[PDB]
Design an enzyme around this catalytic site. Structure first.
Site, short mmCIF file in Angstrom:
data_model
loop_
_atom_site.label_atom_id
_atom_site.label_comp_id
_atom_site.label_asym_id
_atom_site.label_seq_id
_atom_site.Cartn_x
_atom_site.Cartn_y
_atom_site.Cartn_z
N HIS D 53 -47.37 -0.39 -35.88
CA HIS D 53 -48.08 0.82 -36.35
C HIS D 53 -49.40 0.46 -37.03
O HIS D 53 -49.38 -0.23 -38.08
CB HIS D 53 -47.19 1.55 -37.35
N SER D 76 -50.73 -0.62 -31.54
CA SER D 76 -49.70 0.11 -32.32
C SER D 76 -48.42 0.09 -31.50
O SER D 76 -48.52 -0.05 -30.25
CB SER D 76 -50.12 1.54 -32.64
N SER D 81 -48.46 6.84 -34.53
CA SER D 81 -48.37 6.19 -35.86
C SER D 81 -49.72 5.64 -36.33
O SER D 81 -49.83 5.29 -37.54
CB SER D 81 -47.31 5.14 -35.86
N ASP D 131 -42.72 -4.95 -33.75
CA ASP D 131 -41.95 -3.90 -34.45
C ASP D 131 -41.36 -3.05 -33.34
O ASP D 131 -42.07 -2.19 -32.80
CB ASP D 131 -42.86 -3.14 -35.44
N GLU D 156 -40.01 -6.88 -37.01
CA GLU D 156 -40.03 -5.99 -38.18
C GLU D 156 -38.75 -5.18 -38.36
O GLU D 156 -38.40 -4.96 -39.52
CB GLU D 156 -41.21 -5.03 -38.03
N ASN D 181 -36.55 -7.88 -40.74
CA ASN D 181 -35.87 -6.66 -41.19
C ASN D 181 -34.85 -7.01 -42.28
O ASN D 181 -34.74 -6.26 -43.27
CB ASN D 181 -35.20 -5.96 -40.02
N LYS D 186 -37.08 -6.27 -47.41
CA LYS D 186 -37.46 -5.45 -46.25
C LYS D 186 -36.40 -4.38 -46.14
O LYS D 186 -36.66 -3.27 -46.65
CB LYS D 186 -37.69 -6.34 -45.02
N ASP D 190 -38.10 -1.24 -47.75
CA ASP D 190 -38.77 -0.43 -46.72
C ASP D 190 -37.82 0.59 -46.13
O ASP D 190 -38.09 1.81 -46.15
CB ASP D 190 -39.35 -1.44 -45.74
N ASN D 191 -36.69 0.14 -45.58
CA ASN D 191 -35.91 1.04 -44.69
C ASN D 191 -35.38 2.18 -45.55
O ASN D 191 -35.30 3.32 -45.07
CB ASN D 191 -34.76 0.30 -44.03
N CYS D 195 -38.39 5.48 -46.55
CA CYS D 195 -38.02 6.77 -45.98
C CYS D 195 -37.81 7.79 -47.11
O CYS D 195 -38.13 8.99 -46.88
CB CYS D 195 -36.79 6.61 -45.09
N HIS D 315 -36.35 4.46 -34.85
CA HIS D 315 -37.50 3.86 -34.11
C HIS D 315 -37.89 4.60 -32.82
O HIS D 315 -39.15 4.69 -32.51
CB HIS D 315 -37.21 2.37 -33.83
N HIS D 374 -44.66 4.71 -44.72
CA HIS D 374 -44.31 4.17 -46.04
C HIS D 374 -45.57 3.84 -46.83
O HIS D 374 -46.62 3.49 -46.27
CB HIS D 374 -43.53 2.89 -45.93
N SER D 382 -42.25 -5.84 -46.98
CA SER D 382 -42.08 -6.08 -45.52
C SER D 382 -43.11 -7.10 -45.04
O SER D 382 -42.77 -8.04 -44.28
CB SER D 382 -42.17 -4.80 -44.73
N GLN D 386 -43.33 -10.80 -43.34
CA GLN D 386 -43.97 -11.06 -42.03
C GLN D 386 -44.88 -12.31 -42.15
O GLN D 386 -44.83 -13.20 -41.28
CB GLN D 386 -44.79 -9.85 -41.53
#
Ligand SMILES: NC(=O)c1ccc[n+]([C@@H]2O[C@H](COP(=O)([O-])OP(=O)(O)OC[C@H]3O[C@@H](n4cnc5c(N)ncnc54)[C@H](O)[C@@H]3O)[C@@H](O)[C@H]2O)c1
Ligand SMILES: NC(=O)c1ccc[n+]([C@@H]2O[C@H](COP(=O)([O-])OP(=O)(O)OC[C@H]3O[C@@H](n4cnc5c(N)ncnc54)[C@H](O)[C@@H]3O)[C@@H](O)[C@H]2O)c1
Ligand SMILES: NC(=O)c1ccc[n+]([C@@H]2O[C@H](COP(=O)([O-])OP(=O)(O)OC[C@H]3O[C@@H](n4cnc5c(N)ncnc54)[C@H](O)[C@@H]3O)[C@@H](O)[C@H]2O)c1
Ligand SMILES: NC(=O)c1ccc[n+]([C@@H]2O[C@H](COP(=O)([O-])OP(=O)(O)OC[C@H]3O[C@@H](n4cnc5c(N)ncnc54)[C@H](O)[C@@H]3O)[C@@H](O)[C@H]2O)c1
Ligand SMILES: Nc1ncnc2c1ncn2[C@@H]1O[C@H](CO)[C@@H](O)[C@H]1O
Ligand SMILES: [Hg+2]
Ligand SMILES: [Hg+2]
Ligand SMILES: [Hg+2]
Ligand SMILES: [Hg+2]
Ligand SMILES: [Hg+2]
Ligand SMILES: [Hg+2]
Ligand SMILES: [Hg+2]
Ligand SMILES: [Hg+2]
Ligand SMILES: [Hg+2]
Ligand SMILES: [Hg+2]
Lengths: 461, 460, 461, 461
Positions: D53, D76, D81, D131, D156, D181, D186, D190-191, D195, D315, D374, D382, D386
């Site tokens: 993204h 992307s 995104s 990702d 990702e 992930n 992460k 992130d997840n 959200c 996803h 996010h 995240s 990476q």
């Protein structure tokens, strides 16, 4: 040789006194009044009949009234709400108190009479502090001669205020009252946050149930219903709310609750057919909060999910049709103020029966019946208002006014907003809160004194 | 139709698609539209309206028109217009003068275009105001038009304050309804509307994580309560300032630390009185007071680097933006987002770390950086506005004898029964089911089964 | 004439039985196992030494082990955690139990010895069920011969598992163990949500303090720290969190807490100068959740705000330096498991002194010491895992294996994810929850069985 | 004269750069890596194909890779995104990027091929950053000769890791991978919390709907469904949760949600009759979070309450049966990435039809499609992982290993816990948090280094 009391166990006094010394440190508004007014003795000559839950918090209230010059005679306003260590500590201090946890109705009435009478004749009472109106009603119906010399009533709770307004409307109220309930530092502190603290407390002490992930129905969304709904939602209950007032219902929706009725389309016929059996068959816990009658009725009790808890946190037990359950169903005491009510019939039950409800405090106010009611730091607000209200009506001396002058002061009023703010400030300082002082330019811009009051009387907070 | 001025008429189809959705979100207002269409109770009403030109205001305007009214409309804020809403209203043949990003001069010109039709005072007979700017211009500049006006309906706390001031001073010339203090306005819009829209505006302007960061909310009235919850529910550590100890007690019991920007709460006007240690930890300050200079120059100097500053009270002077315009360099990030560089006035290093982020140039942030309150909340406010317009128009104050006028010259609220009727339509919108009292229960608590359910003293 | 027990008061048995019947209705996973395995008697010949808090919830566990064919001898693993009505009901069912609330250390050691010995001689134990490792350690150091006949240990808690993994790494572990703590339906249920329910419960029962608006410091943000922090925040406390683990600290920040250290820059130099006095002087409540030593140290206790509450919900009391407080400060018992600790020194306190801390449960597990620990519907998960673990290690018969076979099985292991899922499903059905069944197409898409397991062993939930 | 890019509008570069400079101040872990490693240029010679993204956050990641020595070519991983200002700023820095918001599927594939090919032939790529696995798949299926010279893939997202693990089990994975992930910084940052931030954000941007008091159904309760449920619940929604994993469902119950299935008893019988039409007819909002296929199927879409919002945050768009809606129902664009889907038929619709659904982002990940995904301070964790993962695999140089050595290193692995802890520490410091340092005695007591790691690999957080 002090003998003018009746409590469960005088040997609980040392424990009571330890808990009153802790409570003083949690009640800065009330102990600020004890310090500010000790020198002036504003209640010197006051003879107060008090009828309010005989808790540790009430102990600090009583000792503040006495520290300001009052004499009192005390009873509890509920059969299960006394803390026996609090009653013992007050009796040990030489103060007449007639109160124990687990009174019969006949014992409850006897206790109130022992405050009214000293040595078998009317006490020289001149003030009343009441919670619920039972003592106020008994004076009006049975002791009108005593009301002639009484300067006023200070009433703690929504239900008592309703009773006072009913009397004033009918011309039967004999002395003026202060509505202590409708101070913001009472109604929007005690009624709401107190129940937030104490409802989940009482349910855990009685049942040790997990609340997280279970279904609740709260009947009402007034101050008590709002606090009660939060008490359960903060524990992770899925809470539904019932209301007759669409404004309160609108608040419940915006606060994130589903608004439902026990009855199809909200219409109670009086018929079983009108009960939403699917809704009530999913509910693990029902709590009544209304100050109204029969809001958890026979047909709802028959429809509730097996093993549901039923309790009331409104002033009087008739919110729930417990008479129906006493007439039809077998009551098994689990422990004091916890009954399994077996819906299999009246005479006898199977010890492993699955078809029961759990009733807390026999339907009486559950926070005080199964735990200790509201915490000291919340009751600080209510009781600082009580003390200010007693000072105000005592100073006015209604009983000594001529008839034409009485007629002009015979009212049910609230304390001025400035006093409500000064109570709040002591509560805020007790948390270590720091209020900002308005600059002269800011005070002019919004049209208030730097000292307050900060809001118009129409303001709802 | 050309009697309008909007950013872009081509946005009309998009605005109409969003009005159709908003009608489905506003059952109280659409219920009134349906209840009163037959009777045309606002036939002959000529309403001057000055309130944020949003989709929600679009539904209000079309409700008034559906009930027989003619209107002329402006926005009450330079950043609050939704250009698609203004375009849809213009496309429906309604006079509207509003766009997002007006200058102050354009703001005044828009209000004057409602007041005037074809160069002369419109034959206006009703006023619908948010904040009091239109009310004030009519009283100071167009007093003769007020001789033919039956009343004012005022939306917001600040406007009602200004009405009560006029009434105190005997300068108010027509009666008013305080719409703000319906419970289905004050305890719906002011609180829950800011709960929805404050964190919305912050995210759209900055896309900052709120969780775990430190906020200071100035004020804990209805807007401050909703603002505090907007932030706390996102995981902010929220501190609250107040001058009102009752509102402060509510903040403490709601689980917030109550603090002052000033040592001991005393602002002595000097830097020495600023609690530098407190303000140096704050990542976000929000003003909610309706007061003046509650985020002052010395507070702005003491704030943590890269703090966000915003106002959700009616007027931008809660924050001393004049100080920042005189001392500090403004870098536009995007519309209604500025970095204010504390390093000097006449330049900044593109990579400077010592700046604040100001939203909507200190104007109402919810409407400036997002879309204000959602339809389903504004339904309550605007159902009250329609009932208030119907009431004052039916009373015909301008047509009364002088003696009858002096008795009707007041700032009143709507009756509780009407507040309850608006709430019931809102509850039904959520699929909520209110219980009907039995005759015995109604007797027991001393109310009609129909209501009203509470005494006028009741605070909810 | 059963007499092989020692409880506070056998006459509490009827009350205990009433509470056990309610607890069975709250423990669907555990009573699902009792019903599924009763016919098959998988623990026929099992002789279990158990040493886990003698609560109503432990009673349902015990009676489950017995219903599947086990004999047990039982002690509590903490001087304050026993519920006397639960111990009485177990003694009354003819099961050897040695436990009462308010044991001395000496009485605690004596109760463990009464489980290990029957008639003065080692019992023919062949299974161990432990919480914290004390019974495991006593068997290894003092009764090594008994471990020759034991098939395995099932260990409830984080601290006990740490001790087993230490023994295994040092080659001192003599029998295989199941880590019950690290089932998800244990660690991410009991340790977290149990402490959410029971920490605020215990503080309210002990003190009746308002929590709303007050400042807390939670030391640790593991599973217990997480649940404890939620217990306090959901009541409206302003919670700060301390951590040594930056990942757990990150989670606290994201959860909406300020992460602070009692020490300046997080560095404890051992001196008073390293204490953040400004921070600790604003704290009303400190809760230790770490399983570590001296995380609420003497210097911290000296710097705490007057009248702060101090408590521990980790397994052992040395999280708080209670030894420093006994040596230096004067203890005033308010009521059992509630002490005011007067910081004025050793040689007398003033009843009215304002400079004290309140210590709950003498620094021992506060939820079990001042309330009743976790609720039945949470302990359901933990105890369904205990039963499955007992069945698994008893069926494997380690003690009977030849030496080379034993060496391959001498491990500390968790239960398989499929059994963790099957416990979870019974807990979900207990809430009325309805899991979706994957289609075969969806199962294939994500590489699982419709039956589960649904997640890889790496999955952290 | 740089022209090796394709973006919506290069004139948005200055706006993108202003937002990058703000983002740098919100990403302390990633900017700490830039500062720590700039001198050593650990990615000197790295040639990274990136497919993720094209947001502002991704811009800070790209400029960190470049600052450490890498060259990249970027696309992307989703048609909606891209932030066009971010893409413009990267192109204006002379970095090849092919990305715009609102690509067709044909344009999407073209953009990925423009990274793979430079001047019409394979680029000299030696690293992959992906990702969701679309770039990884294209390279394996269409460009195997390019994988010979690639040292590794850093993936990702949960769905991409599932795709890698399928290739490794089938022996078709050609280069080693890091599962980014499953760093705790992460997956549990992130997840979940991403959200929590971004779901309600995207719903408000798309619809401006009030969420308080409305009914939601979240399909799934893994990391994204936990965050999603909280995004909605914190706004005041009444949230119900669906799951196939009973352990995730047990978490939902304990977190205060009702767990329900779109199907009667959770079982899809192949027909409309198995849909719980009563449940779905009350739902205002459905959100898919599963990474599975058809979890919001045609029959669910037919049963949803009129005017319900439908969206996906997993996803891929195939969580929802949007192909059914395109075949059968009329799509009215409200504005970009917001459609009303009229269930009255395909050909046209009435403008005032009440029988529609509102679909966000055509069922593509809604946080990125209708908002900005996010926030920077979450994406910091995240993207720090990476960069560490790119450094690790680039340093290992798998492409240059002989065949026998490649076979030992061909794995899908996570970063070591020590690095996950180091990322978390920079995130905590970003909030002003202060972690405590263990004393040597405390480190010995719990068996860890004072530097960490603090937990065993089995720990779930
Ligand atoms: N247990 C405590 O410590 C405590 C504390 C304060 C007050 N009280 C008592 O609690 C009760 C409620 O007090 P309050 O201040 O919240 O009153 P309130 O008037 O603020 O609220 C009661 C609510 O009940 C609702 N209601 C009435 N009948 C109903 C019905 N049939 N179904 C659903 N809702 C219905 C009303 O519309 C109202 O909103 C009173 O009896 C009061 O004296 C108890
Ligand atoms: N942005 C919106 O959509 C929106 C919505 C409703 C109202 N409003 C506006 O928001 C403002 C607040 O309205 P309200 O209804 O909350 O009013 P309110 O009177 O309920 O609350 C204002 C609060 O500010 C406090 N305050 C005043 N001066 C202060 C100071 N120096 N420091 C700290 N606290 C201070 C007061 O004590 C009071 O409690 C008004 O200007 C109103 O018109 C805006
Ligand atoms: N009272 C109960 O009912 C109950 C329930 C479950 C477990 N337990 C006990 O609770 C304790 C904690 O268990 P857990 O499962 O949460 O363990 P855990 O490993 O998940 O969490 C312990 C946390 O303490 C932190 N920590 C260690 N030393 C610290 C220090 N000096 N300062 C701050 N943080 C520090 C660690 O980093 C870790 O994250 C154990 O003793 C366990 O046996 C008690
Ligand atoms: N939008 C974002 O920014 C974002 C962020 C992170 C991950 N993701 C994506 O979100 C998806 C979920 O990721 P995750 O990390 O939460 O995965 P996860 O494995 O942690 O959770 C997915 C859950 O879905 C459940 N599930 C599967 N099929 C189901 C069904 N038919 N009904 C109900 N529940 C069902 C599973 O049991 C599991 O608990 C993946 O596609 C991932 O790549 C998106
Ligand atoms: N701890 C307490 N002590 C005394 N009265 C209390 C306590 N908790 C609740 N109450 C009071 O009970 C009243 C109801 O009879 C409420 O109005 C409230 O003021
Ligand atoms: Hg009473
Ligand atoms: Hg009472
Ligand atoms: Hg509702
Ligand atoms: Hg206006
Ligand atoms: Hg305005
Ligand atoms: Hg406070
Ligand atoms: Hg034990
Ligand atoms: Hg133990
Ligand atoms: Hg991608
Ligand atoms: Hg992707």
């Amino acid at each position: 040789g002090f003998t003018d009391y009746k409590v469960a166990d005088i040997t609980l006094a040392a424990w009571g006194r330890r808990e009153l010394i802790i409570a003083e440190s949690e009640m800065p508004a009330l102990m600020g009044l004890r310090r500010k007014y000790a020198g002036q003795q504003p209640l010197k000559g006051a003879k107060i009949l008090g009828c309010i839950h005989m808790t540790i918090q009430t102990g600090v209230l009583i000792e503040t009234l006495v520290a300001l010059g009052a004499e009192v005679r005390w009873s509890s306003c509920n059969i299960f709400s006394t803390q026996d260590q609090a009653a013992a500590a007050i009796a040990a201090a030489g103060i007449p108190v007639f109160a124990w946890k687990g009174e019969t109705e006949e014992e409850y009435e006897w206790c109130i009479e022992q405050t009214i009478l000293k040595d078998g004749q009317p006490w020289d009472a001149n003030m009343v502090l009441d919670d619920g109106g039972d003592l106020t009603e008994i004076l009006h119906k049975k002791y009108p001669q005593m009301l002639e010399r009484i300067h006023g009533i200070t009433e703690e709770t929504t239900t008592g205020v309703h009773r006072l307004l009913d009397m004033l409307k009918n011309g039967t109220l004999k002395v003026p009252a202060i509505n202590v309930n409708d101070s913001v530092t009472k109604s929007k502190n005690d009624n709401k946050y107190g129940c937030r603290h104490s409802l989940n407390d009482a349910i855990k002490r009685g049942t040790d149930h997990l609340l997280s992930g279970k279904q609740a129905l709260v009947i009402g969304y007034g101050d008590v219903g709002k606090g009660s709904s939060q008490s359960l939602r903060q524990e992770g209950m899925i809470v539904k709310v019932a209301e007759v007032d669409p404004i309160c219902a609108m608040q419940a929706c915006m606060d994130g609750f589903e608004v439902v009725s026990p009855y199809k389309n909200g219409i109670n016929d009086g018929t079983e057919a009108s009960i939403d059996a699917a809704l009530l068959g999913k509910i693990d816990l029902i709590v009544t909060t209304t100050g109204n009658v029969n809001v958890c009725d026979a047909n709802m009790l028959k429809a509730l999910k097996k093993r549901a808890v039923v309790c009331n946190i409104g002033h009087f037990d008739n919110e729930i049709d417990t008479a129906f359950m006493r007439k039809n169903w077998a009551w098994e005491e689990v422990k004091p103020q916890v009954h399994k009510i077996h819906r299999t019939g009246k005479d006898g039950f199977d010890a492993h029966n699955d078809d029961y409800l759990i009733l807390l405090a026999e339907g009486r106010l559950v926070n005080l019946g199964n735990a200790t009611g509201h915490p000291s730091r919340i009751m600080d607000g209510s009781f600082a208002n009580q003390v200010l209200a007693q000072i105000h009506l005592f100073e006015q001396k209604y009983a000594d006014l001529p008839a034409a002058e009485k007629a002009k002061r015979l009212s049910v009023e609230v304390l001025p907003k400035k006093l409500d703010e000064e109570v709040a400030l002591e509560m805020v300082k007790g948390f270590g809160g720091v209020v900002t002082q308005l600059t002269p330019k800011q005070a002019e811009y919004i049209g208030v004194s730097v000292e307050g009051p900060f809001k118009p009387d129409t303001y709802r907070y």
